[PDB]
Amino acid sequence: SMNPPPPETSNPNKPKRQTNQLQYLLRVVLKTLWKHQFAWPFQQPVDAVKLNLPDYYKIIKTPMDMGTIKKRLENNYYWNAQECIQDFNTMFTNCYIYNKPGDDIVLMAEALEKLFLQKINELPT
């Protein structure tokens, strides 16, 4: 179909291990953004069919969304905090390169990104 399969969220042969930073990314970063009033465009993969964005997956080579990130954190998919930070960055990049700068969706992403950056600047060592 027009939409790809969603990104993988389970890492079956990776050992499960906590880190301080991954705890922070789930319990502080993801939780804060997930509950934000503007989270809803970002809580699941973009549905190009329902949104009538037939070129979305032409332009966006690496789909990413917070529902995927949440599942990855809850499944201990990431080997390190930087992979998770990269996924957040990719999500925001996708929004900014696809949508018009004045789109309400872009303005919502910018508010979430500011909060993301504020929390990441306090990432523990």
Ligand X SMILES: Cn1cc(-c2ccc(C(=O)Nc3cc(-c4ccccc4)ccc3N)cc2)c2cc[nH]c2c1=O
3 part of the interface to ligand X, by CB under 6 A: no
Please identify, using beta-carbon distances, which residue of 33 and 46 lies nearer to ligand X. 46
123 part of the interface to ligand X, by CB under 6 A: no
Which pairs with CB-CB distance under 8 Å and at least 24 residues apart come from 84-90?
84/22, 84/25, 85/25, 85/120, 88/29, 88/64, 88/116, 90/62, 90/64
Evaluated on CA atoms 34, 63, 22, 77, the torsion sign reads positive
| Near ligand X in 20-79, by CB under 6 A | 40-42, 46, 51, 53
107 part of the interface to ligand X, by CB under 6 A: no
Sites of contact with ligand X (CB under 6 A): 40-42, 46, 51, 53, 95, 98-99, 105
